Design a protein around this ligand. Structure first.
Ligand SMILES: Cc1ncc(C[n+]2csc(CCOP(=O)(O)OP(=O)(O)O)c2C)c(N)n1
Ligand SMILES: Cc1ncc(C[n+]2csc(CCOP(=O)(O)OP(=O)(O)O)c2C)c(N)n1
Ligand SMILES: Cc1ncc(C[n+]2csc(CCOP(=O)(O)OP(=O)(O)O)c2C)c(N)n1
Ligand SMILES: [Mg+2]
Ligand SMILES: [Mg+2]
Ligand SMILES: [Mg+2]
Lengths: 552, 539, 555
């Protein structure tokens, strides 16, 4: 019963089932303590992927995912991982080791100021300097990682602290509390402003993408019949019932129907809106608009964002109090016409161009065939790139937490490790991950962990042989691409070398059969599907806002 | 004519030959400027390895390696990379982008305090907030990265700053100056203590592992005939002439002849000694000895390290002034016997699979002296660090500061670019391999003549055997195997395999004569590893 | 003309700032120049520390952030302790400081440092604006964060070229920080349930319970349910004269109070806005399992001695009201009534001067009482740090919200007098009383010029013993000897007159009552030198009371 046991004791109380990590000499006492009791250790092939996996656990379970690494380069490898989780509202607790307290100021092996390093990228970055303080520090980490808004917590343990034998008792895993609903006066005022609105619309954001949030949002949308829009991490709010009120997903560029829908609005209700997904300077422009901020925390005042009302409190509760006293909105003919046109423009946008001819599959063809090959309840984790732009915009998701996208840091390589984390959260279910050919290699080494776990993952690789998202953004600004090209690899040979299944779409017509082959395959499968990116530049085309400008 | 050009203008003037990086929306303006002029861009497969490559360029060329990344996750991926370079005396300049100055406080895509993040892990972390300040900020970053002790410098560029058009002129790339040698009276006082010493020993350290230092160290060792020892990053100090005065490499555990040699000495002269490689509480113990600190910067006072003399100045110059007025030391009979027994003990220290010691030697005999050999981190690195002889400066590169996993392969890639047309050998573990194995694509793309050796045991053994000595059980050290040959072939590279311990020498030669990147899978018996921490030898 | 500096003033206008405390400088002068055309009144301070203190006092009294404006370099670095104090004591403060131009920000140039990096670990919000357009946003969010629970300090740094930069940027609406709804309904119901079933339920009113609107609601709860309650030092003023029979003093510093013994005997403790800085839970929540109910605007910090069984997070007054609405009077059993009776008795004996007392100087308890009797309930009393503060914090009764201000977070020396000046600006035309030690006096005594300049009606009481006594008696108790606590005397009367202020002196303990009335009736700043006998001070850390109660209870 030494300090390392205390760390494990906390993990038990927090109900931690899995720990992702990589052992080392400085953190060895805690890994040793985990052999006697505590959660199952998932050994990672890189601490970055260990942090990503934990993030996936966080977003899916609502409870902090736990990552355990050693001092020095082990700790510093969690940097990007935690930074992503901290900016994308995913509860993660990081446990890292450090050199002994007596040599903490010295130039010794793997020593640095851990707490100072993770300070600007976490909600909580502390280093325990007394063994008695372990149960407190770790508990407060779990609570703070979870408390709205969710984020990353980092706890550093000097080696002599985790090895120290102590008679210190454990501490109760007091659950993070939930707020009450927003102020009654604030809700009453909000209902009033929505009822008097000529065209009210709902902007569902990050924290609205929580399951219980989605549950309450849907009840509201059905009763009041408001047209709504999603941010990328709000994917899954849409139901097939609410398809007639759905106006797509806003993000990246102001050239979507939702942006035009938001423009026409006179009252906008934002739900759990972290502006990181889409800056308000992009959508809230052109005329005085009423903004009602509903969130678990106060609003960030921007030039383009100055809420006329703030409903701060538990997001689902606050929505419930609104939905109860709200009544159906009747739209005038003019507003109905606008909604009709936008829904028309929206449908026109989801279609492959008529003049299309190619040896490869169009991105929309890859999107459509994938959704029809994947059940609604199946979790799909997506990477970042041009492929991500298509997925975020056109891949429909009808259930909470089934389309995971990195819309905070837009970190390359998140797809596959999220999928591995997701499969452990939902055992016995197939999990689909989508990535680019460039972003793939960022975390492809974690495929060994997949085969080892026999995880039912289907990884789709959009093959263009370039960092295209940077490329077409270079062409639009400088009329030339720079440092976006790299060599190709045999993706099938790559998979097979890890002990996984590798398939390949040789022709655009084989797409449907290859996908279903993978969805029925056993174990991890990587799928190489070449794509034609000649239409990608139109993702930033302002043709659509122009057409609607003239029509108005 | 805009801020991005200024960054490149500095890179030109600094004589930067290569920039390793990955583009992004915020830093693309500088990537755009590199199309018209400036160094050749090497697109990496991960910013971690791009930073590693730059570290190798720094360690090999003496001028800072440059890495250029984007905002957000681009910047934060440099964390381990820069931290490694900063604690291992390798000059690196990192250039990262950031969000618009007007939105620097907002929750927007890829925003963080870049400068605040790299503060605890660099010698210099600044963020430029005015376009005029670019040539200054960049120039001083290079100077500080180079200045003793060398390390990592980080410069963050708001997107609007690199895109802003200005008529600001560039700034001259003033070279970091060299110090003069240590004080004359200080040099004389040191020489006095050495000639009167019964058993004087030289500890060549990190900053002694520099080329000009080694050249100057060797002249001192030949003339005075001093017994010396190496640290892991001091590999290459040994010459084939000086085999008779060499007493191995100290590190990791106190069970080496060197630890015992230093113990018996009464006066020890340390040269460019960073205590990060081996804490002085391990060797400077059993009895009072006089310590003379020779370095480019002052010493860190430790309980086991309190110098009686500090000769601070240019390392080679200070050494030359010693070598000039020093004379040969005659060793007494007792002391000569101690030196004799330990050199005997040294050789004394030197299955279905191949033994580690078999793999070290057979590689040395299969590899030319001038060929640079990069090593990763693990148990295999311990065998290499202790028994792989290097007879030329900068031919055995080891990460002895952070002990960072995955450094082997990208260092080799950086090296092939530094020494074009030369073969480069990299050694790594099977666990440490996948950390940066995706950078093999960059090697094949560059057609770099790299030879990678993978020690195959299927575990994180260095953690494993230290667990058995502490808790008598291993924890979280096991993982599955992969087909390394198929892996190589999938990248368009050559894959070989040692099926039997006798095939070792022939497979090695195949790779050394092969064209392009080659990976070699060699299985190892690690049942002997546990003796590395055995206290048998000191007893 | 519309320049960057104007945007800063425009924000202050929309925020409804009436006063700005500061000291001008070369880097921040553009904002000072802009304040000449429009904006709040500038209060020139004699040290930036006191400007931070005064701004803090305005925040604690008005609930809106007090504003402090300084220059680059040492001007900014002088705000360190001031802001650190406000940040740990729930007082809204916005600090606006200048810095060198963006082009020389990395250079060794005059008064350059990383302003933001310095104030990062001691404020809720420390940013530096690097674009003139971003000013109205940065500042507005600064005010909101400083006010948002838990209230604290925000620091905004302006490069000289940024505030001097001419820009056509529109201002941004001063959107008010919103209030939470009350705590969760099921959580409140569960709380009432655990309170009704309690043998001895007690309320611990803490820092955030000491706010006016909080106190209003707490009292209604206390009257209806008839719960015994206790105060922390910054919760002073919750007590009403109605509630005297349920009041059990103020816990703090040392565990030797009736309140500490009351909490020990309780089986259910309701904490209200309890920041543990004032008194760590390892001191009071000991010796047996107790049910803890954390009521606050933010979640709880889990300690070994503090692991709540229930958390009611939401607006503090609103949450209390829902409790008060559905709660009923608590009936105490015979055993519990006696425990309350004995403790209420022990409490009364503690507030009394010892019978064998004789001295040429005034006893601390005499100075407290005579001051309380010379001062109206509504008159704000600011207290400094030292042994005198212990007497005041424990024995000076306060019967209205925000009439006894104490620095109980950082325990910063010198806060008394500048707080009074800030108070004097908040309640113009009202007398303000400040209490300090002779050591803590000189830390900020130079602000006496600022009082005299404003002709503020302040009455400053200086406890004269000629030592750092609070350190001294704690040294004798730990080391059997004092170290570095002694210093020379100054003529406090002559000191006041030299600033143009009134100086009085209590030459004999009977003149005490008379001198105070003389001061309370004097015009302009008044300093009062009153000598004190500190021979009884060591009993403040005496463990006699817990010992007697230990024996009396084991009976
Ligand atoms: C760690 C990191 N580095 C750089 C970037 C910038 N970036 C955004 S998209 C992209 C390239 C994606 O390449 P790929 O995997 O091939 O997908 P594609 O764009 O081709 O669809 C890059 C480098 C990033 N978002 N994260
Ligand atoms: C980035 C990083 N993660 C973890 C460690 C801790 N560590 C030191 S050696 C080692 C395992 C080495 O495995 P391998 O590559 O197979 O070499 P081997 O032990 O088998 O010789 C680990 C995980 C480290 N030094 N750096
Ligand atoms: C800035 C600061 N310095 C030191 C202390 C420690 N301290 C607390 S009370 C005290 C001495 C108080 O002297 P005085 O004002 O004369 O009051 P007295 O103790 O005599 O009642 C000291 C030094 C502190 N709380 N803050
Ligand atoms: Mg691609
Ligand atoms: Mg291995
Ligand atoms: Mg005193």
């Amino acid at each position: 019963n030494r300090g390392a046991e205390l760390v494990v004791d906390c993990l038990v109380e927090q109900g931690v089932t899995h720990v992702f990590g990589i052992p080392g000499a400085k953190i060895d006492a805690v890994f040793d303590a985990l052999q006697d009791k505590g959660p199952e250790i998932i050994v990672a092939r890189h601490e970055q992927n260990a942090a990503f996996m934990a993030q996936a656990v966080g977003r899916l379970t609502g409870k902090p995912g736990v990552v355990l690494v050693t001092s020095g380069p082990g700790a510093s490898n969690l940097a990007t991982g935690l930074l992503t989780a901290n900016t994308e509202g995913d509860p993660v607790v990081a446990l890292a080791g450090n050199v002994i307290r007596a040599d903490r100021l010295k130039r010794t092996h793997q020593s640095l100021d851990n707490a100072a390093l993770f300070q600007p990228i976490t909600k909580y970055s502390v280093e325990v300097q007394d063994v008695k303080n372990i149960p407190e520090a770790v508990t407060n980490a779990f609570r703070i990682a979870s408390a709205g808004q969710a984020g990353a917590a980092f706890v550093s343990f000097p080696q002599d602290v985790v090895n120290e034998v102590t008679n210190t008792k454990n501490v109760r895993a007091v659950a993070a509390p939930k707020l009450g609903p927003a102020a009654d006066d604030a809700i009453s005022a909000a209902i009033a402003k929505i009822q008097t609105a000529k065209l009210p619309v709902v902007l569902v954001g990050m924290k609205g993408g929580r399951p219980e949030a989605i549950k309450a949002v849907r009840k509201l949308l059905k009763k009041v019949q408001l047209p709504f829009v999603e941010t990328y991490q709000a994917a899954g709010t849409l139901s097939r019932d609410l398809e007639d009120q759905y106006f797509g997903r806003i993000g990246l560029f102001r050239n979507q129907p939702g942006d035009l829908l938001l423009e026409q609005a006179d009252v906008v209700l934002t739900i759990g809106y972290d502006p990181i997904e889409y800056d308000p300077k992009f959508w809230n422009i052109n005329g005085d608009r009423t903004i009602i901020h509903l969130d678990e925390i106060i609003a960030d005042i921007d030039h383009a964002y100055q809420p006329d009302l703030e409903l701060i409190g538990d997001i689902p509760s606050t929505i419930n109090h609104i939905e109860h006293d709200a009544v159906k909105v009747e739209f005038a003919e003019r507003e109905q016409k606008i909604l009709s046109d936008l829904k028309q423009y929206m449908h026109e946008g989801e279609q492959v161009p008529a003049d299309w001819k190619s040896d490869r599959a169009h991105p929309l063809e890859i999107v459509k065939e994938l959704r029809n090959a994947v059940d609604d309840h199946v979790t799909v984790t997506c990477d970042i790139g041009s492929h991500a732009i298509w997925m975020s915009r056109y891949f429909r998701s009808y259930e909470p937490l089934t389309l995971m996208i990195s819309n905070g840091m837009q970190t390359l390589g998140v797809a596959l490790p999220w999928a591995i984390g997701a499969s452990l959260v939902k055992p016995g279910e197939k999990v689909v991950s989508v990535s680019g050919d460039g972003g793939f290699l960022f975390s492809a080494m974690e495929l060994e962990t997949a085969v080892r776990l026999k995880a039912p993952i289907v990884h789709i690789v959009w093959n263009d042989s370039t960092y295209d998202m940077v490329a077409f953004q270079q062409l639009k600004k400088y009329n030339r691409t720079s440092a976006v090209d790299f060599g190709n690899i045999d993706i099938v040979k790559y998979a097979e070398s890890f002990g996984a299944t590798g398939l390949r779409v040789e022709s655009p017509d084989q797409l449907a059969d290859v996908l279903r082959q993978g969805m029925n395959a056993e174990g991890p499968v990587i799928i190489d599907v070449p794509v034609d990116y000649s239409d990608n530049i139109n993702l930033a085309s302002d043709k659509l806002p122009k057409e609607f400008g003239e029509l108005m």
